[PDB]
Design a protein around this ligand. Structure first.
Ligand code: HDD
Ligand code: HDD
Ligand code: HDD
Ligand SMILES: [Ca+2]
Ligand SMILES: [Ca+2]
Ligand SMILES: [Ca+2]
Ligand SMILES: [Ca+2]
Lengths: 678, 678, 319
């Protein structure tokens, strides 16, 4: 913790200026008790000036996000495939910092927007900082970095009025998607449940690009990075995400914070797919193309180590806001590929930190510093924090005895470009013909989802495209969807009253791939941290008694339990007024409370119908719901919830109720409650 | 070093990026050996981006300057006059940093321009950083801060062509001086020897403004700060300064550096004049007026302690360039007065550091940090280096137990405004009538100079005004000068071919004041560090033996000896090609070298006449010169220098030569060699 | 020109703020005639804030310099060798701006330091701005851009004391030159009279690098840019340059200003050496190597047009 050396404690002591002079900061200096404020009030000005300059530009993308500290532990000595020092011994531990994010919204936008999500991991290795700046979706919208402002301008708010915030549901985005068909693969992922994850802990991370692992002998293999969640994969449903955006814009950052504080810090297996250089085009697409995945059937995952997040930042601004990641932060044993999206990224991340930091010495901020000595001839610049002793900062020199020395493949453990890499041909601004198949892999992805997942994706597209005003853009969108799947274009067209174009089967096929479905990936492996809302009443002393007994039983198994009542008191966490179904992964009514759910309910302490609305919403959104007490039928009738439904629980016995209700939590969503196209 | 904790050592090790990855930095990554450079070359881009951003804006004024670390030691417990902690005990020591500067020139301009000089001192006290931002002249050009950009625009280069650099010798400067008569006092100081000091070590420092000392009981006294040089006062002559500006633009910074490295670190007595609040108008002028001195006859200096500079910086940029002084850096026991120049300065220095530093956390740069803990609720901002633990940074609070506490007169040793201070009357943009005598003190100053000093001042005015093209500006200048002294206006007028206006005696008097004269302040109190050039030859093994014997005898008394000859070899420091009279305080020819001084002397190794020119220039500029060995008449006749002249030495004996010559160095300048008007 | 539309005239009128409100700027607002200055004095603070923020970072190299406006006139239709629009017809005129400079000194350093000199020309062409950022010496010290901070750190002042200003006469410079032998060619030029020119008008300019002329059909030829002074070539002597540095630090900018004002605006012939792609290695060195000239005996100069500088800037900072 270079973070702990820079920590500042203010738990005792008298207020000082920034130069250590004790002062006051509550009243301005004035000429007389009702007089004007004086220019000589240095206390006033130092304080306001600091306030007035507190903000810094938000990131150009991924502005909305949150971070945590942890550790990476290697499972083996990986010398045989990479020279990377953080992977060179069983059990070797490296500190990490991770930031998760959306792409499109500004700071302050809602966590539960539909979007691609960032998953950026810094490894503070003993041979330098290494960053993997990935996303929760393994493919990207575009095939060349020069198009990135085009993609981003199209998805961000229309620039006359700056509407809409954090959403692709507008003409410009679908105009771009429909004119730039490379977008189809990422679009399909973003329109699935991968666009609205349950939490940062319930998504995967991917490096997206093919990279190289380079051995000390100089041989190389091609790799893709996969961070596979140990919490399982899980999504919201859209109608739930929308309400969550309003009720709790901070949902994902709160979830992450709380999991870490409770001792449930999330984990991922850090994995690679590893293939030979000769396989760059063996799989029916080009490994230089970031719109393509390698099916796991062609290349299995190898598990390199464990990533665990287990500590929250001390100061959000200083750590999370100021962390400045770069794919250029590379270490010996890793190399780039000629992926034209990766290639341009290298430029952008060094440049953009000048905007954020306002000066060139951004690598000296505590969160950006390495954990090894720095020896170089970089000097001066605004905000220079070091006092360099070497007064001959040039190479070659004799007056500093030739130091710092050059590092390279054979000296000082230098980074070196993989020596088998070559280039040949004309200097061109031309797209490789090997990149031209934009529709096959979207179809592979779509084929690999379950029927209800396919319906959710169609429904997401129906939602967004129905909000596009241009009839031409809508037609063009159907044209592109039709090339992936005639069925998708037909079902989407039905919602927007246009006809789909005739089937064009060039890229149609029936193939599937493992591991891309959320709903298909079986029950969650753990239910720790999941949220249960127990709906109770201060009316009946039996209701708070039953709530307390359920609480014990659920908290035993690591669930986070919230007892809801009309008013706060001992045992009650939340009022009906502040409660919502978006707040819980499952809801239980204690039978003691059945009168609150009648249609003539009414209280000055919460909005009309709130108790029942929580229960109904939770049911309609596919959550496990139940009534505990043995007079269940009255609440279930008021809800129009069938007692015999999957994921509906009714028991008098607390112990039997809990046992089945917990199986429901693992199932997580009951997908039989959602209507499917015929 | 106080700043040891921020030092970075590069005396060993391999080159790394700023994030600790070992790299190389000598060849670009290319596609083929004769190929184009690749964008993925992160080694290139990080290195060049840093270089591309090395520069920061130069200070708006005082851009050209140099600094050093040292110590202040109090002579006493000054409780009786101030609560200031750094003055509260005999022998109490406080680290300091001082920067000296010119005013008008940009950061690569010559040290030996004619100008006002800056003398800015930071005291890193145990109750906060205290800065005295002074000049080497005790009065300022203007009476209101709002006029500062007018003054500075007028003296800086003309904004169409940015000519001339670091000089007042142009129409705009003299236009402003003639139209704004407040300028007269400082103008006379600037045109005296005080405009072209021999070194930073041979000038005084002044706070200029009246300030207040405040006791812990709340009573106050008015003070002026005086830093009185223990090295004595000394000036260049103009014709010398001009040549030095070209031969060694770094003259003052080099002199300071060298004095420190040789163990001759310069010293000042830190003094105050102290008077009662009741005396603010008792001396015939207003103590709020920064164009006035308090004659020493009315208020003597109290010596408070010793300022010694004895350590050079390690990195100029990080220390000297980045030091950000403010008169707002004040400590308990000191307060401001209603001097309208001081009042506006308090705003400027906080604001201008945003420009220099490019962000609001400039007090976190090592040179600017205090040497005591910081406890405040200032947060965020670009370049934030701290990780603040207190997550409730507001007052008033209970969630951080009311910390940090408010400090004031009665708790926590807070700063407090002197409680006797009041204000009365209309809110006005009007000048006090008490400020209106612009001419009496300029006349007091002029009257207090010796006849030769008066001549030099006149000659500085004749030089500068003769370069003003506008006949009307020149007439306007003589109108103002004439109000100070009819004689001055007459003598100046004679050079520029105008008639002086008739005498106007309203502000004429015959009064004098002690201690403002340089010439009249007797011989220097020490000659340590003064420079002696010995002009020798490799022709004659005799000449180099004489030079070696002289050198040993002069070095024993701490003079810096340079032996000069046609070519370097053992015992010879400099060639005639690189030598100039501007490089010496005294010049000695060894008589074995007499042949070099003939008119038909000529060599491919130095410009024609160079040896003799050094001697002649030294004589004409008032320096002690001599011939050592017994045979003096050929050199002295070649140079047209009378053997019986004051400050001309001829002896055979090295011991007798040096005993006489050292008296000459202490005299420093022989003023009988300069012609007087009339 | 675009320069005229942005010009602001202050030869009449009352003082205003930046937002057009008439104001005064000579006395601070105070609580009584001998009182403290008020925070509500917006006239004071807008003025001093602007002053406080006047400066910008100097250029990392070529900080010390001066500029003038002028015209370039093509001598012919150069279609046969380049598609460049500004060279596509006899008599075609294109506005230019040129800045001349030293390399090593800060703002405020003397014009007559010994140094390589900058000669940077912007052509505001009808198909976009085209800059030739050249020097008065045709070859450069180093063969790879990555080394540029090394060269510059070595020649700039020693970083503990920032001594010496605008000068290669110190250990670090000569350490670098002696350890990096690519430097020798430029070093010889800088140690000649080319290091201390008499004026900006009495030096030539060079693009240094080999560039390509490309025709509309896509064929290319290798070129070197030479701007050849019509005023002739002239130098100071060193002992004169040293005194001049002290007596008149603005010597070259004054000389340029004065020549233009007197109707003696300086001229250059803008020239190229033009060789085939196949001759990249034909002359006993590599045309990709910026430490090498092509001897005029092997490739003669072709005169493309006339560069004339004939108007001084209105505002130095802004232009
Ligand atoms: C050419 C530009 C460009 C391209 C093609 C990309 N990005 Fe990027 N990305 C940026 C330019 C950029 C940026 C503007 O440079 C950002 C904003 C702030 C920053 O540090 O970098 C950024 C931020 C950024 C962040 C946030 C890092 C953090 O939490 O601070 C993530 C996770 C990604 N990007 C991930 C990706 C992935 C997985 C991409 C494709 C595979 C991708 N970006 C393509
Ligand atoms: C209203 C503006 C204003 C006024 C009236 C003054 N100054 Fe000032 N001064 C500045 C505005 C300023 C500044 C723009 O704020 C500078 C530039 C850099 C900095 O830190 O402050 C500055 C710098 C500065 C420095 C350089 C400090 C260093 O070495 O970094 C000195 C020594 C002084 N000044 C001294 C004075 C004296 C003795 C004054 C009158 C008694 C004076 N200044 C009036
Ligand atoms: C990799 C960095 C690098 C390299 C190898 C060079 N320069 Fe450069 N040059 C810069 C980096 C730079 C810079 C840091 O980018 C400057 C500073 C100000 C600016 O606009 O660019 C610059 C300024 C600059 C200027 C001043 C322009 C003006 O008047 O505003 C000239 C004339 C040159 N350079 C000319 C050259 C020549 C003829 C070079 C070799 C043939 C050369 N430079 C190599
Ligand atoms: Ca739109
Ligand atoms: Ca900025
Ligand atoms: Ca002028
Ligand atoms: Ca050096």
């Amino acid at each position: 913790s270079p973070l702990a050396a820079y920590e500042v404690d203010d738990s005792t002591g008298y207020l000082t200026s920034d130069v250590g002079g004790p002062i006051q900061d509550q009243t301005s200096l004035k000429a007389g008790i009702r007089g004007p404020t004086l220019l000589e009030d240095f206390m006033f000005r130092q304080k306001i000036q600091h306030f007035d300059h507190e903000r810094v530009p938000e990131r150009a993308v991924h502005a909305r996000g949150a971070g945590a500290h942890g550790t990476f532990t290697s499972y083996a000595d990986w010398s045989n495939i990479t020279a990377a020092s953080f992977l060179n011994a069983t059990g070797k531990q490296t500190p990490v910092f991770v930031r998760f994010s959306t792409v499109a919204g500004s700071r302050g936008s809602a966590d539960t927007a539909r979007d691609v999500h960032g998953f950026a991991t810094r490894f503070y290795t003993d041979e330098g900082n290494f960053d993997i700046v990935g996303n929760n979706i393994p493919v990207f919208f575009i095939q060349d970095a020069i198009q990135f402002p085009d993609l981003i301008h199209s998805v961000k708010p229309r620039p006359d009025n700056e509407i809409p915030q954090a959403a692709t549901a507008h003409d410009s985005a679908w105009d771009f998607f429909s004119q730039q068909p490379s977008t189809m693969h990422t679009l399909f992922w973003a329109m699935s449940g991968h666009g609205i994850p349950r939490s940062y802990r319930h998504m995967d991370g991917f490096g997206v690009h093919t990279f190289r692992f380079v051995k000390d002998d100089g041989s190389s293999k091609l790799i893709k990075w996969h961070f596979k969640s140990r919490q399982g994969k899980a999504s919201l449903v859209w109608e739930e995400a929308q309400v969550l955006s309003g009720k709790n814009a901070d949902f994902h950052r709160q979830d992450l914070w709380d999991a870490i504080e409770s001792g449930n810090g999330p984990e991922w297996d850090v994995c690679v797919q590893i293939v030979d250089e000769s396989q760059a085009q063996a799989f029916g697409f080009d490994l230089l193309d970031p719109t393509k995945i390698i099916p796991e059937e062609y290349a299995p995952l190898t598990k390199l180590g464990l990533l665990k997040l287990d500590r929250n930042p001390t100061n959000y601004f200083a750590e999370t806001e100021q962390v400045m990641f770069q794919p250029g932060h590379i270490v010996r044993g890793i190399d780039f590929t000629e992926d034209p999206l990766l290639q341009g990224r290298l430029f952008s991340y060094l440049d953009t930190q000048l905007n954020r930091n306002g000066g060139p010495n951004f690598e000296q901020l505590p969160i950006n510093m390495p954990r090894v000595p720095i020896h170089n001839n970089n000097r001066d610049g605004a905000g220079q924090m070091f006092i360099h002793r070497n007064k001959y900062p040039y190479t070659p020199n004799t007056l500093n005895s030739g130091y710092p020395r050059q590092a390279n493949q054979n000296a000082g453990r230098g980074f070196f470009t993989a020596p088998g890499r070559t280039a040949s041909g004309a200097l061109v601004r031309e797209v490789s013909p090997t990149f031209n198949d934009h529709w096959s892999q979207p179809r592979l992805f779509f084929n690999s989802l379950t029927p209800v997942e396919q319906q959710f994706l169609v429904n997401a597209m129906r939602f967004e495209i129905s909000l596009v005003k241009s009839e031409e853009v809508k037609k063009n969108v159907l044209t592109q969807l039709n090339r992936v799947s005639h069925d998708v274009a037909v079902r989407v067209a039905a919602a927007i009253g246009l006809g789909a174009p005739d089937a064009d089967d060039t890229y149609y096929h029936n193939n599937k791939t493992a591991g891309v479905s959320i709903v298909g990936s079986g029950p969650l492996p753990t239910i720790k941290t999941l949220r249960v809302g127990i709906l109770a009443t201060t009316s009946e002393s039996s209701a708070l008694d039953q709530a307390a007994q359920l609480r014990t039983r659920l908290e035993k198994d690591g669930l986070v339990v919230t007892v809801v009542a009309e008013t706060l008191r001992e045992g009650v966490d939340q009022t009906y007024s502040t409660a919502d179904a978006t707040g819980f992964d499952g809801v239980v009514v204690v039978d003691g409370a059945a009168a609150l759910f009648a249609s003539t309910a009414s209280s000055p302490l919460f909005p009309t119908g709130r108790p029942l609305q929580i229960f109904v919403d939770a049911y309609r959104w596919g959550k496990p719901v139940g009534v505990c007490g043995g007079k269940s039928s009255e609440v279930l009738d008021a809800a129009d919830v069938p007692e015999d439904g999957d994921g509906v629980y009714s028991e008098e016995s607390v112990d039997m109720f809990v046992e089945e209700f917990e199986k429901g939590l693992a199932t997580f969503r009951f997908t039989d409650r959602f209507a499917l196209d015929s």
